[PDB]
């Protein structure tokens, strides 16, 4: 399917969200690990295409969550709005699956 991983720096006082469109009845899996900065803790957020929260966790160093998906835009976020001063270095890995033919599907 799609195995994808990145490591990015998140300034203090900032929340950053990422959008991931999905087929219907695919399977999104996300995993994160805070690597550096502060108490190595982050707030993690995962909302449905409808705006419904599917995952919310405060001050975590790591987490894993998997979904059976609807068809829409899923957004996951990493929140460091609580830290004054200390930045955070976050690693996350997105794994898409169960998706079965053009550039339309490819670009979105
Ligand atoms: Br798609
Ligand atoms: Br934890």
Q: Where are the domains of the chain?
A: 1-108
Residue 99 Cα to ligand 1 midpoint, Å, equals 8
Residue 81 Cα to ligand 1 midpoint, Å, equals 31
Q: Which H, E and C letters describe the chain, residue by residue?
A: CEEEEEEEEECCCEEEEEEEEECCCCCCEEEEEEEECCCCCEEEEEECCCCCEEEEEEEECEEEEECCCCCEEEEEEEEECCCCCCCEEEEEEEEECCCCCCHHHHHC
- CA 34 from chain centre, in angstroms, equals 13
Query: Contact at 8 Å (CB) between 18 and 79?
Result: no
Residue 100 Cα to ligand 2 midpoint, Å, equals 35
Residue 19 Cα to ligand 1 midpoint, Å, equals 12
Q: Rounded to the nearest 10 degrees, how much is the dihedral formed by the CA atoms of 7, 8, 14, 17?
A: -60
Residue 5 Cα to ligand 1 midpoint, Å, equals 18
**Structure-determination technique:** X-ray
The pair of structure tokens assigned to 5 is: 């991983």
Rg for the chain (alpha carbons), in Å?
Answer: 14
Residue 11 Cα to ligand 2 midpoint, Å, equals 20
* Length of the chain measured in residues: 108
Nearest ligand (C-alpha, residue 32): 2
Beta-carbon contacts of 104 under 8 Å, excluding residues fewer than 6 positions away, are none
């Amino acid at each position: 399917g799609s195995d994808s991983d990145f490591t990015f720096t998140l300034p203090a006082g900032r929340k950053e969200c990422f959008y991931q469109p999905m087929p219907l009845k695919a399977s999104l899996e996300i995993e994160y690990q805070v690597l550096d900065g502060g108490e190595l803790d982050i707030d993690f957020h995962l909302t449905s295409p409808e705006g419904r929260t599917l995952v919310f966790e405060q001050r975590k160093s790591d987490g894993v969550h998997t979904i059976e998906t609807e068809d829409g835009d899923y957004m996951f976020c990493f929140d460091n709005t609580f830290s004054t001063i200390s930045e955070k270095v976050i690693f996350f890995e997105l794994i898409l699956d169960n998706m079965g033919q053009g550039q339309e599907d490819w670009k979105k």
